[PDB]
Design goal:
It is built from 8 helices and 9 strands. The protein has about 270 residues and is α/β, with parallel strands linked by helices. The chain has a single domain, classed as TIM Barrel (Alpha-Beta Barrel). The longest helix has 17 residues. It binds a molecule of 3 linked components (BGC-BGC-ZZ1). It comes from Acetivibrio thermocellus (strain ATCC 27405 / DSM 1237 / JCM 9322 / NBRC 103400 / NCIMB 10682 / NRRL B-4536 / VPI 7372).
């Protein structure tokens, strides 16, 4: 019942990318995270899934519908694609944590409630999420566990932590994403400062919580101490969190655990045995 350690490793998780990250952090990955879109069939996923299961890890897939908005989805216009994914995931048989339409309380994704076209509402979101789950259950894909998500902050008009919550009957895990951006954009914020408000909201739901994406910048503060403090906070005060999934990518800023030697040493120590 210890905290599970996961990561998006900055590239799709081939066998070598998983093993390299495990060498890097000095520990097994309990969870391996990958991002795919809604024009990707399971056969493209399968070699990555095999690598993850062969390593003895849980695959978490963030499933991003760039190709269909919530109205599209709830009206059934993607159902052939959803049905094929469900059938293929059932046939695969292994436990997959699937996180569709994430960060919908932001404004950066075309399925999010804050997205500037105004097309996605609480109602269309909930109906879309429920429709996906319904199709998977009709196809016997009970191995697929459903992850609800919020961004740490509500960004854009109409956004909230729970307005778009599809209900306990459709969710196995909840989750929060968030970053300490430092001065890269923004101000330096502790893990608590980033995550406390969203956690308070999700703690009202009797589902375990995953920190599905998090990381810190180097600039504007001490990233090594931030990492030490983040994991201590998770263990001390975020008792409903069961997993911490770092976002290891040199992208908007260097989120990587090895953005500096000091950060790497702190991460290796913080994740524990
Ligand atoms: C303006 C704002 C405010 C905030 O609180 O949070 C975010 C998050 C955000 O995008 C998400 O977080 C990171 C950091 O910006 C993005 O990199 C990430 O994009 C996803 O990255 C993966 C891996 O590179 C891709 O495969 C996915 O396709 C992509 O969606 C977002 O989750 C933006 C703005 C923002």
């Amino acid at each position: 019942s210890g905290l599970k350690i996961g990561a998006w490793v900055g590239t799709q998780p081939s066998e070598s990318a998983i093993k390299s990250f495990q060498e890097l952090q000095g520990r097994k990955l309990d969870i391996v995270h990958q991002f795919i879109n809604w024009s990707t069939d399971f056969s493209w996923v399968r070699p990555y899934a095999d690598a993850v299961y062969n390593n003895g890890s849980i695959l978490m897939i963030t499933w991003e519908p760039w190709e269909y908005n919530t109205v599209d989805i709830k009206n059934g216009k993607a159902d052939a694609y959803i049905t094929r994914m469900a059938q293929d995931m059932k046939a695969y048989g292994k436990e997959i944590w699937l996180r569709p339409l994430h960060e919908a309380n932001g404004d950066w994704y075309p399925w999010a409630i804050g997205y500037s076209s105004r097309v996605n509402t609480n109602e269309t979101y909930i109906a879309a999420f429920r429709h996906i789950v319904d199709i998977f259950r009709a196809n016997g894909a009970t191995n697929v566990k459903w992850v609800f998500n919020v961004n740490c902050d509500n960004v854009g008009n109409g956004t909230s932590y729970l307005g778009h919550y599809p209900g306990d009957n459709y969710v196995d895990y909840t989750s929060i994403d968030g970053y300490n951006w430092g001065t890269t954009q923004s101000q330096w914020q502790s893990f608590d400062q980033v995550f406390s408000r969203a956690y308070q909201a999700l703690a009202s739901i009797n589902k375990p919580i995953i920190i599905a994406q998090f990381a810190s910048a180097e600039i504007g503060g001490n990233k090594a101490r931030w990492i030490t403090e983040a994991y201590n906070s998770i263990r001390t005060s975020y008792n409903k969190v069961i997993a911490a999934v770092w976002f290891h990518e040199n992208k908007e800023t260097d989120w990587r655990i090895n953005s500096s030697p000091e950060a790497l040493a702190a991460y290796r120590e913080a994740i524990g045995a």
